[PDB]
């Protein structure tokens, strides 16, 4: 029942350093090895490096070398990954993993005794933007003639210009969940995020039922509920 517990998510200005932790417990050796792998948006999975704490032996990837630094604290079964000259494309999710070997890894993986990276951390999300923290302006997507289809109306919320992710949206304090779609945020050229949350209801309910989006941006630090009400549009 070996498990790896990484540190919380992290938002860093470009150029800054980030150091995420990882706490093994419980491996069956002091001579375990820990790899670090990042999930990077658009380029896939990606091996960075590797540390065997007992001997403090480290092997980094060429593409990183200059910026990565693996370290350990043998007393507390924790390793640390420090990426340094942070560019905007280091924005990614950072995993630590066990290298399962029958033999202590002291340089390369010795392939005949390898069993894969068999246990991973939860991940740590690291966002790299010049941007500064900010809550969103929530605007209504009003139901109307132009948001209708054969008995059905669509309405919603525009969660606009925040940083960093994440924001959450429920509808009518979570009472209304069937038919809801909340789209992946999107990164504007301003460096600020913007999503839309949307519902389909039957049109005849716009008059009797009241609809509200609940927007929680936990970073900074808005809680806002907007009442979405029907708007008038050209019949033709």
């Amino acid at each position: 029942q070996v498990q790896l517990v990484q540190s919380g998510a992290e938002v860093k200005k470009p150029g800054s350093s980030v150091k995420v932790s990882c706490e093994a417990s419980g491996v069956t050796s002091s001579s375990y090895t820990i790899s670090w792998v990042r999930l990077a948006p658009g380029q896939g999975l990606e091996w960075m490096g590797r540390i065997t704490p007992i001997f403090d032996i480290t092997n980094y990837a060429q593409k990183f070398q200059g910026r990565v630094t693996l370290t350990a604290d043998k007393s507390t079964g924790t390793t640390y990954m420090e990426l340094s000259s942070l560019r905007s494309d280091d924005t990614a999710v950072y995993y630590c993993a066990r290298d399962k070997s029958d033999v202590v890894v002291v340089t390369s993986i010795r392939p005949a005794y390898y069993y894969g990276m068999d246990v991973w951390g939860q991940g740590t999300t690291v966002t790299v933007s010049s941007a500064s923290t900010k809550g969103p302006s929530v605007f209504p997507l009003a139901p109307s003639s132009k948001s209708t289809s054969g008995g059905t109306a669509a309405l919603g919320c525009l969660v606009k210009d925040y940083f960093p992710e994440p924001v959450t949206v429920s509808w009518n304090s979570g009472a209304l969940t069937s038919g809801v779609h909340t789209f992946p945020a999107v990164l504007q050229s301003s460096g600020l995020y913007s999503l839309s949350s949307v519902v389909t209801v039957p049109s005849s309910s716009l008059g009797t039922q009241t609809y509200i989006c609940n927007v929680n941006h936990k970073p900074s630090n808005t809680k806002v509920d907007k009442k979405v009400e029907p708007k008038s549009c050209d019949k033709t």
């Binding site: 999975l45 990276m117 525009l158």
Partner: protein, 214 residues
């Protein structure tokens, strides 16, 4: 240095089906290959090592094969929870290199989207900026072209979009395209359209509104 290319980059399939992902290594790696499954909010899962050796806890339906530079991962009978991305990893030489991942999506019927358009809010308009949201609801395949026109005059470069993940109940997608102008340029025209083409569309569906009636 070794580069791993898998195929296909993506593939749609059904529960029950026989799925096989392929892996080519840029130089021989003997049998030193592992397969990883990854879903959304979760870390990769190890499935296979030494090309064919199955992990303690991985279902019998998963099988690996290959040696040298051609390898194969095979789900025999697909399954509700096998919809994910699969990565192969080479652990011959260092560095460890992964494949680019193969996303395996569900296969449902063709479904035409239902289109909606949304005029700027009264209160966004107080701010100098005006956003127009076109919504494409519940469709398949994931491919859709969204085109803004003002008035009948094609925009380009003001319109970010976003797609929902393949819905859990009906396996359809949803899209949210978003035109963004200034309360000045807006405000210069009357006719905001939003034309949509899909595979399940006879003819390009358009939703449009007259400004200042909305």
């Amino acid at each position: 240095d070794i580069q791993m290319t898998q195929s296909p980059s993506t593939l749609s399939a059904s529960v029950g089906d026989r799925v096989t992902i392929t892996c080519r290594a840029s130089q021989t790696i003997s049998s030193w290959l592992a397969w990883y499954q990854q879903k959304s909010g979760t870390a990769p899962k190890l499935l296979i090592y030494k090309a064919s050796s199955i992990v303690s806890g991985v279902p019998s339906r998963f099988s690996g094969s290959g040696s040298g530079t051609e390898f194969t991962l095979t789900i025999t009978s697909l399954q509700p929870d096998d919809f994910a991305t699969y990565y192969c990893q080479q652990y011959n030489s260092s560095p460890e290199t992964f494949g680019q991942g193969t996303k395996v999506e569900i296969k449902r019927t063709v479904a035409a989207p239902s289109v909606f358009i949304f005029p700027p809010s009264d209160e966004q308009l107080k701010s100098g900026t005006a956003s127009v949201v076109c919504l494409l609801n519940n469709f398949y395949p994931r491919e859709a072209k969204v085109q803004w026109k003002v008035d009948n005059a094609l925009q380009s470069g003001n319109s970010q979009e976003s797609v929902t993940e393949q819905d859990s109940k009906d396996s359809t997608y949803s899209l949210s395209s978003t035109l963004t102008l200034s309360k000045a340029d807006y405000e210069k025209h009357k006719l905001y359209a939003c034309e949509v083409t899909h595979q399940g569309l006879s003819s390009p569906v358009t939703k449009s509104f007259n400004r200042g009636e909305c």
